[PDB]
């Protein structure tokens, strides 16, 4: 990465380079600064009303709650809360601080310890078949912690119920709160419980002297989406100003990238935050503070080529920028010689008004050579002869030559 010649020598894997012209990587431009744009929010999320509550719900009638317009700084849980199980599925935990979440729902219930392994996408069992089921395409997090000091009573607490004896298996995020008599045999239950007709709900005991597997556990399931919509709920990152017409690193509501930001003529419907192109890349974005549409454009663009007379004679080179009209910015350096061919700006070569044959082709009728300096010139097709052609004159030979040539195949 010192110069284009060294780029070439690394490409070929040799310290020596032969006469010619070589294509190199394209013209790159590196970002100057970094931009972050999140919404304007002040409230902190209700971590206490959710985690530090008074009574939870039963797994058969599990509770669900919406969360919106809040900052998700969870380090406030470190002083009080100690979780036994925490698992996130469509996201890594080391990234929860630099994202913004879209449709956040919290589900809450109480179960027995040995059943906690059942809160997962597959995991058949009593809890997953009849009480609570997660989908296969789940994006969110599961959290569980012991509560034997609150939900346990000496004589036994009998206020937490689970459903046994269902006819079929539940579907994802479905709830059944029916109290009907379950027919095990073929006898036709007339709404009474005899010997094959069961009440389908049962209770836990939850005594404090029980074993760690028969002790109560409080469970919270958080569900959300990422990077397709306004994303009201956000993290604790701090925002900056807007910078335009400059290559920057940016984070827009959790979406990171690199490029130049400009003003656009597009118009988004209120249920839109991002815009994609044919290749599914993000080309437009709405600002979460000003609400104006910005276009995104890359920074690296344009081909580059190197012209070399050979390292056994010189280390002088010329450089050709194919998409520049220097008559003068996007270049690795300026100098004393600039030509502006039809194949790009040529830097490092002297232009002469003569015409020779082609030694090193460049293009559009331009060739190069080494004289000592490097010269560029329009090449020659040959000489002029101007046959005579009178209407009564003829030329005829008076001698001959025997020629011998070679052809190799």
């Amino acid at each position: 990465a010192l110069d284009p010649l060294s780029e070439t020598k690394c490409t070929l894997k040799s310290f020596t380079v032969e006469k010619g012209i070589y294509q190199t990587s394209n013209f790159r431009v590196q970002p100057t600064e970094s931009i972050v744009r999140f919404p304007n929010i002040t409230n902190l999320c209700p971590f206490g009303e959710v985690f530090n509550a008074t009574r939870f719900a039963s797994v058969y009638a599990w509770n669900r709650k919406r969360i919106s317009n809040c900052v998700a700084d969870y380090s406030v849980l470190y002083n009080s809360a100690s979780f036994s199980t925490f698992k996130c599925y469509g996201v890594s935990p080391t990234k929860l601080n630099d994202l913004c979440f879209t449709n956040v729902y919290a589900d809450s219930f109480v179960i027995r310890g040995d059943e906690v392994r059942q809160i997962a996408p597959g995991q058949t069992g009593k809890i997953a078949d009849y009480n609570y089921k997660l989908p296969d395409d789940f994006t969110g997090c599961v959290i569980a912690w012991n509560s034997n000091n609150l939900d346990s009573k000496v004589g036994g607490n009998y206020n937490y119920l689970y459903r046994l004896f269902r006819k079929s298996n539940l579907k994802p995020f479905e709830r059944d709160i029916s109290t009907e008599i379950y027919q095990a045999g073929s006898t036709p239950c007339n709404g009474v419980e005899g010997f094959n007709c069961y009440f389908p709900l049962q209770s836990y005991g939850f005594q404090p002297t029980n074993g760690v597997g028969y002790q109560p556990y409080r469970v919270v399931v958080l569900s959300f989406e990422l990077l397709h919509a306004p994303a009201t709920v956000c993290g604790p990152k701090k925002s900056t100003n807007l910078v335009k017409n400059k290559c920057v690193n940016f984070n827009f509501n959790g979406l990171t990238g690199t490029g130049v930001l400009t003003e656009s003529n597009k118009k988004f419907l209120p249920f839109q935050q991002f815009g994609r192109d044919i290749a599914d890349t993000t080309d437009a974005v709405r600002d979460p503070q000003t609400l104006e549409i910005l276009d995104i454009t890359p920074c690296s663009f344009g081909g580059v080529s190197v012209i070399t007379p050979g390292t056994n004679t010189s280390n002088q080179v010329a450089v050709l920028y194919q998409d520049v009209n220097c008559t003068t910015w996007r270049v690795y350096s300026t100098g004393s010689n600039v030509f502006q061919t039809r194949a790009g700006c040529l830097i490092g070569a002297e232009h002469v008004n003569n015409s020779y044959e082609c030694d090193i082709p460049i293009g559009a009728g331009i060739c190069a050579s080494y004289q000592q300096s490097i010269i560029a010139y329009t090449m020659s097709l040959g000489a002029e002869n101007s046959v005579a052609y009178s209407n009564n004159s003829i030329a005829i030979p008076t001698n001959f030559t025997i020629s011998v040539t070679t052809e190799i195949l």
């Binding site: 394209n26 000489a383 052609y389 030329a395």
Partner: protein
């Protein structure tokens, strides 16, 4: 057809974009990009050799005379007119304006906003040819003037002038007809020739299909390459920045490797098909050079090679990415 389009690919910009993680992950493979570009470079070098082998037979640039005292034959529609910047012919112009479509495209123009900008923003480059259209036209005019002032002599040494009707007499003798026929029906023969050239012009002022097929094929290939970037290849997303924004270093490497593999495969397929097409183009160009040497610089006795009928002469004209032969029989 005589030539196709030259192309180069920056593989890092196509596969990884402006991401440094993908860039460092891609160094493992490494050799395959160098391989691909070696192949494409070979193709590009072969194209100019094709053009040169067809159009640059003679190295004396013969100028045409200002009298035009031929035996009633009129080559005004095939010879140049010193009036346009394209110092070329009537029929050559008609051909030029019948095929759609190297040059410069600045960043300021593509900034914000076609298909070419999208190609360029992903490392797909089209290179200009070495010989310009003006040079090819010069070559063609030199060949015409040689044929018209000297006959089949400028192809075996130095040009020896001879009157035109005296040359048509030789070319008649060559098909099995005496000279008296020519010298006795000269006027009729010249009028027939002129009306036939006029019919050619009138039918072209209203079939160039293969020269168009070539262009269309190339464009299709490059745009297919661009569109194949919306594929996931068995991964959670097709965008690297989503992956990198919701996943860490260890969990993201899996998906990034999947994407790398797939996009490498795509480029490989592109290069393979280009290799297979360049061979067709090479065969056609070799045939065209054989035809320029045997049908223009001489007189052929092969059947249905230089036309349909008993061959008398031929004239060349240039066309975008090819050549048009006018056979007189």
């Amino acid at each position: 057809p005589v030539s196709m389009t030259k192309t180069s690919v920056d593989c890092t910009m196509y596969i990884c974009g402006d991401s440094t993680e993908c860039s460092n992950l891609l160094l493992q493979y490494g050799s395959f990009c160098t391989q691909l570009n070696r192949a494409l470079t070979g193709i590009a070098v072969e194209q100019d050799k094709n053009t040169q082998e067809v159009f640059a037979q003679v190295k004396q640039i013969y100028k045409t005379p200002p009298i035009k005292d031929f035996g009633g034959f009129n080559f005004s529609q095939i010879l140049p007119d010193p009036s346009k910047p394209s110092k070329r012919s009537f029929i050559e112009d008609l051909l030029f304006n019948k095929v759609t479509l190297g040059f410069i495209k600045q960043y300021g123009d593509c900034l914000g906003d076609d298909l070419i900008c999208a190609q360029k923003f992903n490392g797909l480059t089209v290179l200009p040819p070495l010989l310009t259209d003006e040079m090819i036209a010069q070559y063609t005019s030199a060949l015409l003037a040689g044929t018209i002032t000297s006959g089949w002599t400028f192809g075996a040494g130095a040009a020896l002038q001879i009157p035109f009707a005296m040359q048509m007499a030789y070319r008649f003798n060559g098909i099995g007809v005496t000279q008296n026929v020519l010298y006795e029906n000269q006027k009729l023969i010249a009028n027939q020739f002129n009306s036939a050239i006029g019919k050619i012009q009138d039918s072209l002022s209203s079939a160039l299909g293969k020269l168009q097929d070539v262009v269309n094929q190339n464009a299709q290939a490059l745009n297919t390459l661009v569109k194949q970037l919306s594929s996931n290849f068995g991964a959670i997303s097709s965008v690297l920045n989503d992956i990198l924004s919701r996943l860490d270093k260890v969990e993201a490497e899996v998906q990034i490797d999947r994407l790398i593999t797939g996009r490498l495969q795509s480029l490989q397929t592109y290069v393979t098909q280009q290799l297979i097409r360049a061979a067709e183009i090479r065969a056609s160009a070799n045939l065209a050079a054989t035809k320029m040497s045997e049908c223009v610089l001489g007189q052929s006795k092969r059947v249905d090679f230089c036309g349909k009928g008993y061959h008398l002469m031929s004239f060349p004209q240039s066309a975008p990415h090819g050549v048009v032969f006018l056979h007189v029989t």
